[PDB]
Write a protein that binds this ligand. Sequence first.
Ligand code: EV4
Length: 377
Amino acid sequence: FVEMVDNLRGKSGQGYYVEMTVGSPPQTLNILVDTGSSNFAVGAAPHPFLHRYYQRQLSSTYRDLRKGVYVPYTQGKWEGELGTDLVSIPHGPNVTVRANIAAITESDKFFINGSNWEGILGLAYAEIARPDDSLEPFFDSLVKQTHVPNLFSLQLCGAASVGGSMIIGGIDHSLYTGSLWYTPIRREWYYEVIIVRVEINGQDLKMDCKEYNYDKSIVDSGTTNLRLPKKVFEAAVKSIKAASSTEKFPDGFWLGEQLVCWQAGTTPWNIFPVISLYLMGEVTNQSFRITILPQQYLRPVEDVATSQDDCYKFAISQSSTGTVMGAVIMEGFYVVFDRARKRIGFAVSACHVHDEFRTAAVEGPFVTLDMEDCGYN
Ligand SMILES: CN(C(=O)CCCn1c(N)nc2cc(Cl)ccc21)C1CCCCC1
């Protein structure tokens, strides 16, 4: 799948985008890859932050659905006009499909000033499509209309700019080492999974596992951070604050409220612990674990334009909507979204940034009992 390798570009913290064309003749746009939403939505008006926008007047294959969509969220919103048009991915399979497109005509704190992307490609399921599950997501359209197998895979490579690979319709063996390990997709809405055990430095947090998945755990390329439920994040940092005693830091640091800095290069990775998430396996009583480094959860902030050292945001933080395995997780791994078999695969990435003493890993099998129980109803 060589034509697809390295088809993702981005800047640190601003997400990963892929080049897409919409309409006839084709209009090129950069489109954020988002496994945490299900709408294909593109800027359609000259917002000042946008390099470019979808011009429906130029497209002979444009069809109006004559229906609006309104998408509110915490700090903002986007809204627009539903329609369909012809859509392709130049560095993706060699096919063109008719997909639903939300033409965004108003938004608040949605677009990033300084970023080079102009829309979002929600790769998750119809269940969370807006305004409702009858709006067929792009990837469902793609599979329905071509012979492209029902799966895609992501290698997010992380670095000011980032690259990676979205392989649509298959798996590229050169993007990973060792074996793939699969965790079941518990339900087709978000890419929901079940974490069954957590260890910081080989030490079990010994929380009821149900806590880990309260009330969801999801895989999300649209989120930078590893995000954790309040009750689990308290426990996580308690053990993280404790594994890292040689040095102390502001309390706000841990709340993602202040930054932390050391003399350039002088960052002590090693006083920071590895974190291991055991996921539900394919077999009864069987699990596997993925292990990430501090080099994954301490992410270097380029933008302190009032600083001269090495400052990082603690990239773990809390939620009311459950665990989110964002780019901090995904960047250590090759992630396989095997929709045809309702499972997600993880292997060690051939690109993840490794150091002398400690390495990201995917290991199994382990014996874990009562893994169902870990899920929330
Ligand atoms: C505000 N945002 C987020 O909080 C991202 C985290 C959750 N999330 C994801 N993955 N896709 C999203 C789409 C919307 Cl409309 C709102 C939240 C989203 C998104 C704004 C649009 C681009 C991705 C970040």
